[PDB]
Design a protein around this ligand. Structure first.
Ligand SMILES: [Mg+2]
Ligand SMILES: [Mg+2]
Ligand SMILES: [Mg+2]
Ligand SMILES: [Mg+2]
Ligand SMILES: [Mg+2]
Ligand SMILES: [Mg+2]
Ligand SMILES: [Mg+2]
Ligand SMILES: [Mg+2]
Ligand SMILES: [Mg+2]
Ligand SMILES: [Mg+2]
Ligand SMILES: [Mg+2]
Ligand SMILES: [Mg+2]
Ligand SMILES: [Mg+2]
Ligand SMILES: [Mg+2]
Ligand SMILES: [Mg+2]
Ligand SMILES: [Mg+2]
Ligand SMILES: [Mg+2]
Ligand SMILES: [Mg+2]
Ligand SMILES: [Mg+2]
Ligand SMILES: [Mg+2]
Ligand SMILES: [Mg+2]
Ligand SMILES: [Mg+2]
Ligand SMILES: [Mg+2]
Ligand SMILES: [Mg+2]
Lengths: 113, 200, 85
RNA sequence: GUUUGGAGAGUUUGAUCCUGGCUCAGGACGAACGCUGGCGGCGUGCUUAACACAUGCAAGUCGAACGGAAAGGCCCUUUCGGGGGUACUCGAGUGGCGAACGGGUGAGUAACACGUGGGUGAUCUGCCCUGCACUUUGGGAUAAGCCUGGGAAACUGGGUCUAAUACCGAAUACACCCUGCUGGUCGCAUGGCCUGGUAGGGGAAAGCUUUUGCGGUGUGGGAUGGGCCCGCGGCCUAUCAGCUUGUUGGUGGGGUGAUGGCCUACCAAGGCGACGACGGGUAGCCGGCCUGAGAGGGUGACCGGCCACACUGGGACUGAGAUACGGCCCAGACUCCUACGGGAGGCAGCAGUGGGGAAUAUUGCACAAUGGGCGCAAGCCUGAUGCAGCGACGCCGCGUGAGGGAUGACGGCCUUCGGGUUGUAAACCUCUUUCAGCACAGACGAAGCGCAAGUGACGGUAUGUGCAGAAGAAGGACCGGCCAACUACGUGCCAGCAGCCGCGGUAAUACGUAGGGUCCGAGCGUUGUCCGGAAUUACUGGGCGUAAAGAGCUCGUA
């Protein structure tokens, strides 16, 4: 069966995962049919991106998600949408963008002067 | 590693001021040792080599790290000599020296290494840390009243502060508006000889 | 002989070989009988045994002993032989 | 269009110019060796014997298929020796699925093996997804159990007995498979398509569960994984010129999922070769890597993709799928057991042992994370994997202190006996404790998992906050010219040095030591190996009157 898996990238103690469509038999770090997303658990909130157009196609043809990929598809709303259930908007959290560096430079200029 | 041996003998061999406040250099501007007076045969290689030695023993960078700096400078789109100089100028121990909070680049290194500075609110004790545009460098609370740093506050004036740096507060807060262009950088060295040395 | 599942599979592979061998033999006897009928020249007997052999080929493909395409090839060859002879 | 990119030096002569080889300075490594050695991050580690392998692990799982009841549990019961029931549960066994993946190695292979681009009107595809139809009806066994036989063991026979989603017969299917006739249409010749129309014959199934409920059969389409064919591309060797008779082609049969001498009978006499056939040697191939201004040269460790093999050689079986590493059968070599009749093994899985060698690690800890197998699921399994241990083996980062300190100590070493060097160096005087040390806090990786409410192997690790005190932390090579860095003493063609030219013959900047110096630094040197320099195989980019080089001269085939 063709499945949607996490493949491990990154270095020791820094697991970064790509969301890939691959045959069940293929080894984890093996050739993938498509990369449809990425998942970085070490972040807060863990980084999640999914190409929803491709996720819908692959679930349509019958790709079977793995357990963690199924959790991610529910957060993104791609699972609920594919099935017809509600919640398609999803509950995806995004990291608050840190203050821009230029603005903090202006802040320091004003503060001291 | 670091070079921790005598500092004057290096400036004496190279015939130029590295610390620039050194009385023992001006007293004996000839190279060190028994034969330091004797006539040395000229060669282009010795000239190129000594310009490299002036660079790396001014900033306190080992040859391994300095050669990586060269490759980056040559890779960068500008002219290699300007890129190399401003990369070494971006070093945090150098920025601290240019700001005035230290007496010597050796003193600047020790301070940064011992954990007295913060960059954009995060502690950095890496002397080779390269500052970028709009970096803000601050002093931790414990080291603000620290006796040599107190000296540094009321010893402002030893050297001039370059335009890309700016000390804005009595907290001794350093701002970097940009990386220095070659004109901004003022160093007793001919950079074109080092580019030629590594093209050998 | 080392792993439990393999030891069990030794027994089960043998059971299946016997089942398949028996069926294949039956098919082979049936095809042989038809061939002899066609070489004897007896259109009536040959036609009767074509139909029974053909159905036997189809049933062997249902048990998974031969591939459906192999059954089609055999059936086709027999029927062509009866039409030509 | 277009700048991002090319350095040379020594050595033939009394001297010179040229030609030309040799040698050196650079970079690289799955390295080894010598001296030396503080810490951390991230990688990496049998290159040799595809040599032989002690020991433990590396593939199981399903009671929601089944008879059952050895272990638990619960319920009777007791005399307390045991004896029943239940089926929550579960040993052994039947049955299903997995075991063909994942992991290893590079022996073989000069080949459609691999790379890249096509072809299939010549094909298969379990589990997964999504349409349609269905899931009717009977039957006979057997493992396990119990009795008993043979055997030293491995194992094995007979009787009696039981079940199923195990096995087997029939009906139905008319989507599907085979054959005959026949219509339209698209091409690329066989042909393909219209599930074309039509006649005749034929092809299946299985139940369980009471819960997020899981299944079974045929058939249409999809997705995935393949099979087979072809163009083009990447080694040395004619001191290897002919090779081939299933060999080249055809027809009738056989065979396969499929095309095809794939096989076979007959018939024709072809097919491949200086655009190197057939031989010999070597070698897994590639993305890439190293070097190089580029072109090129060399190379294929790790990581990733294909291929090949699994003690050696041969063979098939089961299955959707098999080089079937931890399957089977036979033969051989080797090891082991035996009652001498006969049996049993296979680390090129992980770890480890012996051996070979200059040289390459622990008989760790977890399934917490990611991937995989089975299960409705809870879960179980996983030496895949995530991590830990060991080796400066590599890359990168940091420390071994900072400021001040004199006409400049002692001591060492030169000397023109004036001194000069070491050297701001040291001593001393203050200043900061990074990394190590001693305390106290303490993770992220888990919008995970179980929803029963507990759950991180790494780990009380990383990282924060305190304390004490410069406190514990520098070596290696070189110093004639290339090529940065010079003097004294000791032996005097000796002992020795050396990459090349060359240095040692009682005044050596080349030998050995010392002082001083230079280049690098937790490394520094040496050896081996490849590229560069080498325009020294020259496509970019060279030559042939006399330096190496015009065939003795013609004619003429490709
Ligand atoms: Mg280093
Ligand atoms: Mg046929
Ligand atoms: Mg090996
Ligand atoms: Mg059981
Ligand atoms: Mg395998
Ligand atoms: Mg059945
Ligand atoms: Mg034929
Ligand atoms: Mg080989
Ligand atoms: Mg070149
Ligand atoms: Mg089969
Ligand atoms: Mg094995
Ligand atoms: Mg197996
Ligand atoms: Mg091993
Ligand atoms: Mg040995
Ligand atoms: Mg899992
Ligand atoms: Mg679950
Ligand atoms: Mg196990
Ligand atoms: Mg020199
Ligand atoms: Mg060349
Ligand atoms: Mg060479
Ligand atoms: Mg020439
Ligand atoms: Mg000519
Ligand atoms: Mg000549
Ligand atoms: Mg002539």
């Amino acid at each position: 069966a063709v499945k949607i898996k996490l493949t491990r990238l990154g270095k020791i103690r820094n697991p970064q995962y790509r969301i890939i469509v691959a045959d069940a038999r293929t080894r984890r770090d093996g050739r993938a049919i498509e990369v449809i997303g990425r998942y970085h658990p070490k972040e807060e909130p863990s980084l999640i991106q999914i190409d929803s157009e491709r996720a819908q196609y692959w679930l349509g043809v019958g790709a079977q998600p793995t357990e963690p990929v199924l959790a991610l598809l529910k957060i993104t709303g791609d699972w609920q949408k594919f099935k017809g259930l509600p919640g398609a908007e999803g509950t995806l959290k995004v990291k608050e963008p840190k203050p821009s560096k230029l603005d903090l430079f202006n802040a320091a200029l004003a503060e001291a002067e | 590693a670091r070079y921790t041996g005598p500092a004057t003998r290096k400036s004496r061999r190279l015939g130029v001021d590295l610390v620039g406040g050194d009385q023992s250099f001006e007293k004996r501007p000839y190279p060190p040792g028994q034969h330091g007076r004797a006539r040395i045969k000229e060669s282009e290689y010795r000239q190129q080599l000594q310009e490299k030695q002036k660079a790396r023993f001014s900033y306190g960078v080992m040859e391994k790290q300095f050669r990586r700096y060269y490759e980056e400078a040559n890779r960068q789109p500008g002219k290699t000599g300007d890129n190399l100089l401003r990369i070494l100028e971006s070093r945090l121990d150098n920025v601290v020296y240019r700001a005035g909070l230290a007496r010597t680049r050796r003193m600047a290194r020790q301070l940064v290494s011992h954990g007295h500075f913060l960059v954009n609110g995060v502690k950095v004790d890496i002397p080779s840390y390269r500052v970028s545009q709009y970096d803000i460098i601050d002093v931790k609370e414990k080291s603000l009243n620290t006796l040599p740093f107190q000296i540094a506050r009321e010893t402002a004036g030893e050297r001039p502060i370059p335009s890309w740096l700016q000390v804005v507060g009595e907290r001794q807060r350093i701002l970097v508006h940009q990386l220095p262009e070659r004109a901004q950088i003022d160093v007793p060295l001919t950079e074109q000889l080092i580019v030629e040395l590594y093209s050998k | 002989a080392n792993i439990k599942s393999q030891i069990k599979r030794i027994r089960t592979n043998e059971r299946r070989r016997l089942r398949n061998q028996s069926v294949k033999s039956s098919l082979r006897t049936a095809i042989r009988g038809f061939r002899e009928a066609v070489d004897a020249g007896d259109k009536d007997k040959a036609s009767e045994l074509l139909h029974a052999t053909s159905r036997k080929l189809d049933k062997a493909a249902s048990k998974g002993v031969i591939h459906p395409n192999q059954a089609a090839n055999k059936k086709s060859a027999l029927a062509l032989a009866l039409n030509k002879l």
